[PDB]
PDB file of C-alpha atoms in Angstrom:
ATOM      1  CA  UNK A   1     -30.818 -83.905 -32.198  1.00 47.00           C
ATOM      2  CA  UNK A   2     -30.006 -83.816 -28.374  1.00 44.70           C
ATOM      3  CA  UNK A   3     -32.632 -83.458 -25.549  1.00 43.98           C
ATOM      4  CA  UNK A   4     -33.797 -79.850 -24.783  1.00 46.68           C
ATOM      5  CA  UNK A   5     -36.065 -78.545 -21.991  1.00 45.78           C
ATOM      6  CA  UNK A   6     -37.813 -75.209 -22.670  1.00 47.84           C
ATOM      7  CA  UNK A   7     -39.640 -73.417 -19.829  1.00 48.44           C
ATOM      8  CA  UNK A   8     -42.006 -70.706 -21.001  1.00 49.66           C
ATOM      9  CA  UNK A   9     -42.696 -68.038 -18.293  1.00 47.25           C
ATOM     10  CA  UNK A  10     -45.200 -65.298 -19.244  1.00 50.53           C
ATOM     11  CA  UNK A  11     -46.893 -62.207 -17.720  1.00 55.61           C
ATOM     12  CA  UNK A  12     -50.678 -62.130 -16.897  1.00 56.98           C
ATOM     13  CA  UNK A  13     -50.852 -58.330 -16.270  1.00 54.89           C
ATOM     14  CA  UNK A  14     -53.648 -56.011 -17.561  1.00 53.78           C
ATOM     15  CA  UNK A  15     -50.864 -54.404 -19.670  1.00 49.80           C
ATOM     16  CA  UNK A  16     -50.252 -57.893 -21.225  1.00 49.86           C
ATOM     17  CA  UNK A  17     -53.796 -57.702 -22.783  1.00 51.45           C
ATOM     18  CA  UNK A  18     -53.326 -56.997 -26.562  1.00 52.30           C
ATOM     19  CA  UNK A  19     -49.820 -58.502 -26.107  1.00 51.56           C
ATOM     20  CA  UNK A  20     -51.648 -61.770 -25.125  1.00 53.74           C
ATOM     21  CA  UNK A  21     -51.943 -62.867 -28.813  1.00 52.90           C
ATOM     22  CA  UNK A  22     -48.184 -62.113 -29.248  1.00 50.02           C
ATOM     23  CA  UNK A  23     -47.415 -64.312 -26.155  1.00 52.21           C
ATOM     24  CA  UNK A  24     -49.852 -67.047 -27.411  1.00 52.34           C
ATOM     25  CA  UNK A  25     -48.260 -67.303 -30.926  1.00 50.47           C
ATOM     26  CA  UNK A  26     -44.850 -67.026 -29.198  1.00 49.80           C
ATOM     27  CA  UNK A  27     -45.268 -70.310 -27.465  1.00 49.60           C
ATOM     28  CA  UNK A  28     -47.194 -72.420 -29.967  1.00 51.52           C
ATOM     29  CA  UNK A  29     -44.792 -71.497 -32.830  1.00 55.03           C
ATOM     30  CA  UNK A  30     -41.846 -71.922 -30.394  1.00 57.61           C
ATOM     31  CA  UNK A  31     -43.049 -75.448 -29.450  1.00 59.65           C
ATOM     32  CA  UNK A  32     -43.768 -76.754 -32.985  1.00 56.58           C
ATOM     33  CA  UNK A  33     -40.580 -75.230 -34.544  1.00 56.22           C
ATOM     34  CA  UNK A  34     -38.490 -76.957 -31.808  1.00 53.61           C
ATOM     35  CA  UNK A  35     -40.378 -80.311 -32.217  1.00 50.99           C
ATOM     36  CA  UNK A  36     -39.118 -80.271 -35.868  1.00 49.41           C
ATOM     37  CA  UNK A  37     -35.425 -79.599 -34.996  1.00 51.81           C
ATOM     38  CA  UNK A  38     -35.573 -81.864 -31.857  1.00 51.24           C
ATOM     39  CA  UNK A  39     -37.165 -85.290 -31.173  1.00 51.75           C
ATOM     40  CA  UNK A  40     -36.833 -84.512 -27.395  1.00 49.84           C
ATOM     41  CA  UNK A  41     -38.089 -80.930 -26.783  1.00 50.27           C
ATOM     42  CA  UNK A  42     -39.825 -80.963 -23.391  1.00 56.12           C
ATOM     43  CA  UNK A  43     -41.999 -77.856 -22.881  1.00 56.80           C
ATOM     44  CA  UNK A  44     -43.338 -76.445 -19.587  1.00 57.20           C
ATOM     45  CA  UNK A  45     -45.478 -73.397 -18.803  1.00 57.27           C
ATOM     46  CA  UNK A  46     -45.763 -70.813 -15.967  1.00 56.67           C
ATOM     47  CA  UNK A  47     -47.857 -67.725 -15.280  1.00 57.84           C
ATOM     48  CA  UNK A  48     -46.882 -64.642 -13.189  1.00 54.63           C
ATOM     49  CA  UNK A  49     -48.058 -60.985 -12.645  1.00 54.51           C
ATOM     50  CA  UNK A  50     -47.592 -60.090  -8.881  1.00 57.21           C
ATOM     51  CA  UNK A  51     -50.544 -61.956  -7.133  1.00 60.43           C
ATOM     52  CA  UNK A  52     -47.821 -64.716  -7.315  1.00 63.79           C
ATOM     53  CA  UNK A  53     -46.168 -67.296  -9.630  1.00 66.51           C
ATOM     54  CA  UNK A  54     -48.495 -70.104 -10.793  1.00 69.30           C
ATOM     55  CA  UNK A  55     -46.859 -73.222 -12.227  1.00 68.82           C
ATOM     56  CA  UNK A  56     -49.408 -74.545 -14.819  1.00 73.08           C
ATOM     57  CA  UNK A  57     -47.738 -77.337 -16.871  1.00 75.23           C
ATOM     58  CA  UNK A  58     -44.688 -79.519 -16.040  1.00 80.13           C
ATOM     59  CA  UNK A  59     -42.069 -80.075 -18.846  1.00 82.33           C
ATOM     60  CA  UNK A  60     -43.968 -82.470 -21.237  1.00 84.12           C
ATOM     61  CA  UNK A  61     -43.654 -83.972 -24.766  1.00 83.64           C
ATOM     62  CA  UNK A  62     -47.398 -83.386 -25.595  1.00 84.46           C
ATOM     63  CA  UNK A  63     -47.373 -80.582 -28.085  1.00 83.79           C
ATOM     64  CA  UNK A  64     -51.154 -80.259 -28.467  1.00 80.55           C
ATOM     65  CA  UNK A  65     -51.523 -80.014 -24.636  1.00 81.15           C
ATOM     66  CA  UNK A  66     -49.250 -76.962 -23.981  1.00 82.06           C
ATOM     67  CA  UNK A  67     -50.862 -75.156 -26.986  1.00 83.37           C
ATOM     68  CA  UNK A  68     -54.373 -75.383 -25.446  1.00 82.55           C
ATOM     69  CA  UNK A  69     -53.033 -74.559 -21.955  1.00 82.39           C
ATOM     70  CA  UNK A  70     -51.253 -71.434 -23.204  1.00 86.08           C
ATOM     71  CA  UNK A  71     -54.174 -70.298 -25.445  1.00 83.55           C
ATOM     72  CA  UNK A  72     -56.663 -70.870 -22.528  1.00 82.28           C
ATOM     73  CA  UNK A  73     -54.875 -68.170 -20.433  1.00 80.94           C
ATOM     74  CA  UNK A  74     -56.338 -64.737 -19.632  1.00 79.63           C
ATOM     75  CA  UNK A  75     -54.844 -61.716 -17.779  1.00 80.08           C
ATOM     76  CA  UNK A  76     -55.787 -60.098 -14.425  1.00 76.46           C
ATOM     77  CA  UNK A  77     -54.796 -56.628 -12.925  1.00 76.37           C
ATOM     78  CA  UNK A  78     -52.352 -54.563 -10.778  1.00 77.86           C
ATOM     79  CA  UNK A  79     -51.746 -50.828  -9.893  1.00 72.22           C
ATOM     80  CA  UNK A  80     -47.911 -50.783 -10.288  1.00 70.54           C
ATOM     81  CA  UNK A  81     -46.393 -51.040 -13.830  1.00 67.80           C
ATOM     82  CA  UNK A  82     -43.277 -53.016 -12.603  1.00 68.10           C
ATOM     83  CA  UNK A  83     -44.080 -56.753 -12.137  1.00 64.05           C
ATOM     84  CA  UNK A  84     -42.703 -59.669  -9.980  1.00 63.06           C
ATOM     85  CA  UNK A  85     -41.445 -62.073 -12.737  1.00 62.00           C
ATOM     86  CA  UNK A  86     -37.890 -62.549 -11.412  1.00 64.85           C
ATOM     87  CA  UNK A  87     -39.298 -64.481  -8.361  1.00 65.57           C
ATOM     88  CA  UNK A  88     -40.884 -66.869 -10.892  1.00 67.28           C
ATOM     89  CA  UNK A  89     -37.432 -67.006 -12.627  1.00 69.38           C
ATOM     90  CA  UNK A  90     -36.004 -67.902  -9.121  1.00 66.59           C
ATOM     91  CA  UNK A  91     -38.584 -70.598  -8.250  1.00 65.63           C
ATOM     92  CA  UNK A  92     -38.625 -72.050 -11.834  1.00 64.57           C
ATOM     93  CA  UNK A  93     -34.789 -72.431 -11.620  1.00 63.15           C
ATOM     94  CA  UNK A  94     -34.884 -74.158  -8.141  1.00 65.08           C
ATOM     95  CA  UNK A  95     -38.129 -76.258  -8.349  1.00 67.13           C
ATOM     96  CA  UNK A  96     -36.452 -79.151 -10.296  1.00 64.63           C
ATOM     97  CA  UNK A  97     -39.107 -81.642  -9.086  1.00 63.15           C
ATOM     98  CA  UNK A  98     -42.117 -79.417 -10.040  1.00 62.55           C
ATOM     99  CA  UNK A  99     -40.850 -77.935 -13.364  1.00 62.09           C
ATOM    100  CA  UNK A 100     -39.525 -81.417 -14.409  1.00 65.56           C
ATOM    101  CA  UNK A 101     -35.951 -80.338 -15.416  1.00 64.81           C
ATOM    102  CA  UNK A 102     -33.894 -83.299 -16.888  1.00 62.82           C
ATOM    103  CA  UNK A 103     -30.169 -83.722 -17.896  1.00 57.52           C
ATOM    104  CA  UNK A 104     -30.228 -81.842 -21.314  1.00 61.68           C
ATOM    105  CA  UNK A 105     -30.164 -78.044 -21.806  1.00 63.82           C
ATOM    106  CA  UNK A 106     -32.654 -75.825 -19.951  1.00 59.83           C
ATOM    107  CA  UNK A 107     -34.144 -72.625 -21.413  1.00 61.53           C
ATOM    108  CA  UNK A 108     -36.181 -70.231 -19.305  1.00 61.48           C
ATOM    109  CA  UNK A 109     -38.002 -67.973 -21.800  1.00 63.09           C
ATOM    110  CA  UNK A 110     -39.261 -64.973 -19.768  1.00 62.92           C
ATOM    111  CA  UNK A 111     -42.026 -62.885 -21.357  1.00 66.53           C
ATOM    112  CA  UNK A 112     -43.077 -59.442 -19.998  1.00 65.78           C
ATOM    113  CA  UNK A 113     -44.457 -56.056 -21.232  1.00 66.80           C
ATOM    114  CA  UNK A 114     -43.081 -53.940 -18.302  1.00 69.09           C
ATOM    115  CA  UNK A 115     -40.239 -53.283 -15.814  1.00 69.13           C
ATOM    116  CA  UNK A 116     -39.944 -55.352 -12.576  1.00 68.35           C
ATOM    117  CA  UNK A 117     -39.493 -55.127  -8.777  1.00 66.86           C
ATOM    118  CA  UNK A 118     -35.864 -55.756  -7.667  1.00 66.29           C
ATOM    119  CA  UNK A 119     -34.693 -56.536  -4.095  1.00 66.14           C
ATOM    120  CA  UNK A 120     -35.506 -53.955  -1.321  1.00 67.99           C
ATOM    121  CA  UNK A 121     -38.498 -52.591  -3.437  1.00 70.81           C
ATOM    122  CA  UNK A 122     -40.668 -54.984  -1.315  1.00 71.68           C
ATOM    123  CA  UNK A 123     -40.429 -53.066   2.030  1.00 69.84           C
ATOM    124  CA  UNK A 124     -43.260 -50.595   1.194  1.00 68.58           C
ATOM    125  CA  UNK A 125     -45.468 -53.787   1.378  1.00 69.00           C
ATOM    126  CA  UNK A 126     -43.874 -54.684   4.833  1.00 69.05           C
ATOM    127  CA  UNK A 127     -41.915 -57.782   3.594  1.00 68.82           C
ATOM    128  CA  UNK A 128     -38.633 -57.508   5.632  1.00 66.33           C
ATOM    129  CA  UNK A 129     -37.215 -61.051   5.005  1.00 61.57           C
ATOM    130  CA  UNK A 130     -34.720 -61.647   2.110  1.00 61.68           C
ATOM    131  CA  UNK A 131     -35.203 -64.517  -0.378  1.00 60.35           C
ATOM    132  CA  UNK A 132     -33.381 -67.702   0.827  1.00 59.84           C
ATOM    133  CA  UNK A 133     -32.982 -69.182  -2.727  1.00 62.21           C
ATOM    134  CA  UNK A 134     -34.817 -72.532  -2.031  1.00 61.84           C
ATOM    135  CA  UNK A 135     -38.099 -74.095  -3.368  1.00 59.03           C
ATOM    136  CA  UNK A 136     -41.480 -72.875  -1.923  1.00 61.39           C
ATOM    137  CA  UNK A 137     -44.033 -74.451  -4.375  1.00 58.78           C
ATOM    138  CA  UNK A 138     -47.032 -76.330  -2.793  1.00 57.01           C
ATOM    139  CA  UNK A 139     -50.443 -76.275  -4.663  1.00 56.86           C
ATOM    140  CA  UNK A 140     -48.744 -74.755  -7.793  1.00 55.83           C
ATOM    141  CA  UNK A 141     -48.590 -71.246  -6.190  1.00 56.64           C
ATOM    142  CA  UNK A 142     -45.355 -69.663  -4.870  1.00 57.48           C
ATOM    143  CA  UNK A 143     -46.698 -69.467  -1.256  1.00 59.52           C
ATOM    144  CA  UNK A 144     -43.584 -67.593   0.022  1.00 60.46           C
ATOM    145  CA  UNK A 145     -44.314 -64.419  -2.096  1.00 60.70           C
ATOM    146  CA  UNK A 146     -46.351 -63.178   0.940  1.00 62.92           C
ATOM    147  CA  UNK A 147     -43.259 -63.375   3.271  1.00 63.89           C
ATOM    148  CA  UNK A 148     -39.683 -63.163   1.662  1.00 65.79           C
ATOM    149  CA  UNK A 149     -38.815 -60.583  -1.021  1.00 66.93           C
ATOM    150  CA  UNK A 150     -37.773 -60.269  -4.664  1.00 66.50           C
ATOM    151  CA  UNK A 151     -34.252 -61.799  -4.936  1.00 61.74           C
ATOM    152  CA  UNK A 152     -30.995 -59.859  -5.571  1.00 61.17           C
ATOM    153  CA  UNK A 153     -29.429 -59.764  -9.126  1.00 60.05           C
ATOM    154  CA  UNK A 154     -26.429 -61.914  -7.942  1.00 57.69           C
ATOM    155  CA  UNK A 155     -28.852 -64.444  -6.309  1.00 58.92           C
ATOM    156  CA  UNK A 156     -30.190 -65.097  -9.873  1.00 62.34           C
ATOM    157  CA  UNK A 157     -26.641 -65.403 -11.317  1.00 63.40           C
ATOM    158  CA  UNK A 158     -25.731 -68.063  -8.687  1.00 65.26           C
ATOM    159  CA  UNK A 159     -28.817 -70.374  -8.860  1.00 67.87           C
ATOM    160  CA  UNK A 160     -29.243 -70.050 -12.691  1.00 67.28           C
ATOM    161  CA  UNK A 161     -25.594 -71.273 -13.043  1.00 67.81           C
ATOM    162  CA  UNK A 162     -25.825 -73.986 -10.284  1.00 70.18           C
ATOM    163  CA  UNK A 163     -29.089 -75.491 -11.615  1.00 67.62           C
ATOM    164  CA  UNK A 164     -27.710 -74.866 -15.198  1.00 69.76           C
ATOM    165  CA  UNK A 165     -30.606 -72.946 -16.885  1.00 70.96           C
ATOM    166  CA  UNK A 166     -30.045 -70.266 -19.609  1.00 74.77           C
ATOM    167  CA  UNK A 167     -32.785 -67.540 -19.390  1.00 70.98           C
ATOM    168  CA  UNK A 168     -33.818 -65.459 -22.435  1.00 70.81           C
ATOM    169  CA  UNK A 169     -35.383 -62.041 -21.684  1.00 70.68           C
ATOM    170  CA  UNK A 170     -38.150 -61.940 -24.332  1.00 73.40           C
ATOM    171  CA  UNK A 171     -39.629 -58.372 -23.866  1.00 72.93           C
ATOM    172  CA  UNK A 172     -41.286 -55.497 -25.928  1.00 71.74           C
ATOM    173  CA  UNK A 173     -39.183 -53.013 -27.969  1.00 70.35           C
ATOM    174  CA  UNK A 174     -39.845 -49.944 -25.673  1.00 72.67           C
ATOM    175  CA  UNK A 175     -38.514 -51.948 -22.641  1.00 73.66           C
ATOM    176  CA  UNK A 176     -35.772 -54.148 -24.356  1.00 74.19           C
ATOM    177  CA  UNK A 177     -32.999 -51.613 -23.607  1.00 74.93           C
ATOM    178  CA  UNK A 178     -33.510 -52.000 -19.773  1.00 76.87           C
ATOM    179  CA  UNK A 179     -33.225 -55.789 -19.554  1.00 77.67           C
ATOM    180  CA  UNK A 180     -30.102 -55.843 -21.771  1.00 76.39           C
ATOM    181  CA  UNK A 181     -28.312 -54.186 -18.744  1.00 71.56           C
ATOM    182  CA  UNK A 182     -29.710 -56.928 -16.410  1.00 70.96           C
ATOM    183  CA  UNK A 183     -28.111 -59.203 -19.109  1.00 69.98           C
ATOM    184  CA  UNK A 184     -24.780 -57.396 -18.394  1.00 72.32           C
ATOM    185  CA  UNK A 185     -25.323 -57.876 -14.625  1.00 73.25           C
ATOM    186  CA  UNK A 186     -26.347 -61.587 -15.080  1.00 72.42           C
ATOM    187  CA  UNK A 187     -23.812 -63.167 -17.555  1.00 72.26           C
ATOM    188  CA  UNK A 188     -24.740 -65.847 -20.203  1.00 73.87           C
ATOM    189  CA  UNK A 189     -28.405 -64.659 -20.485  1.00 75.67           C
ATOM    190  CA  UNK A 190     -29.796 -63.059 -23.660  1.00 77.32           C
ATOM    191  CA  UNK A 191     -32.796 -60.933 -24.690  1.00 77.25           C
ATOM    192  CA  UNK A 192     -35.513 -61.211 -27.402  1.00 76.18           C
ATOM    193  CA  UNK A 193     -37.879 -58.533 -28.754  1.00 76.38           C
ATOM    194  CA  UNK A 194     -41.436 -59.861 -28.426  1.00 75.46           C
ATOM    195  CA  UNK A 195     -43.818 -58.611 -31.175  1.00 71.90           C
ATOM    196  CA  UNK A 196     -46.370 -59.952 -33.753  1.00 73.08           C
ATOM    197  CA  UNK A 197     -43.380 -62.058 -35.052  1.00 75.02           C
ATOM    198  CA  UNK A 198     -41.367 -64.802 -33.246  1.00 72.84           C
ATOM    199  CA  UNK A 199     -38.392 -64.977 -35.711  1.00 68.32           C
ATOM    200  CA  UNK A 200     -36.187 -62.860 -33.397  1.00 68.12           C
ATOM    201  CA  UNK A 201     -36.891 -65.153 -30.338  1.00 69.96           C
ATOM    202  CA  UNK A 202     -36.575 -68.501 -32.201  1.00 66.62           C
ATOM    203  CA  UNK A 203     -33.176 -67.481 -33.753  1.00 64.17           C
ATOM    204  CA  UNK A 204     -31.707 -67.387 -30.166  1.00 63.82           C
ATOM    205  CA  UNK A 205     -33.286 -70.664 -29.020  1.00 64.14           C
ATOM    206  CA  UNK A 206     -32.050 -72.165 -32.315  1.00 64.41           C
ATOM    207  CA  UNK A 207     -28.679 -70.305 -32.077  1.00 62.96           C
ATOM    208  CA  UNK A 208     -28.165 -72.005 -28.652  1.00 66.01           C
ATOM    209  CA  UNK A 209     -29.354 -75.360 -30.165  1.00 66.60           C
ATOM    210  CA  UNK A 210     -26.455 -75.500 -32.706  1.00 65.02           C
ATOM    211  CA  UNK A 211     -23.840 -74.881 -29.915  1.00 65.89           C
ATOM    212  CA  UNK A 212     -24.732 -78.331 -28.363  1.00 63.93           C
TER     213      UNK A 212
END
């Protein structure tokens, strides 16, 4: 019965079209299943692809509002198959005042269809500066994506533990076996297999719920 904060990050890539339904149902059925097990299940929503991270909805108790704001979404496009989602995972962890993180438990559900850009991959786009690990959210866009780079794997492990968020790498079966080694490099994280069903993903959210 304790307070929980779930933050739903998902991918808006052209490759996420067709998977869009799977990442719409996996959000609405996450929300309403957790509202049954918890009286205080604050849900927030963020969009990412590589144009940048867009924070859409602060952690709220209005169930019917997140469901319309998630189902409203539509994808865009990019040349490269690896995406920029870990910078959203960075900013979402740090941006306490924008995301709305309170004193319960904090669950960053990351949804993708593809690989991602790690640190030093950025330099072909002439982005020399390293990520500083602080907040850079203004009008809801991550304005610093144009200047500093994709964070290092240990820079996640630090600020996820300091801010006390547990991320869950919800990803498609072909690509699951990659992120489970980023789950060995970043301890205490998990991994879900996104599909037409949510039962895999909800059993990890609800496995972590009974530990509390």
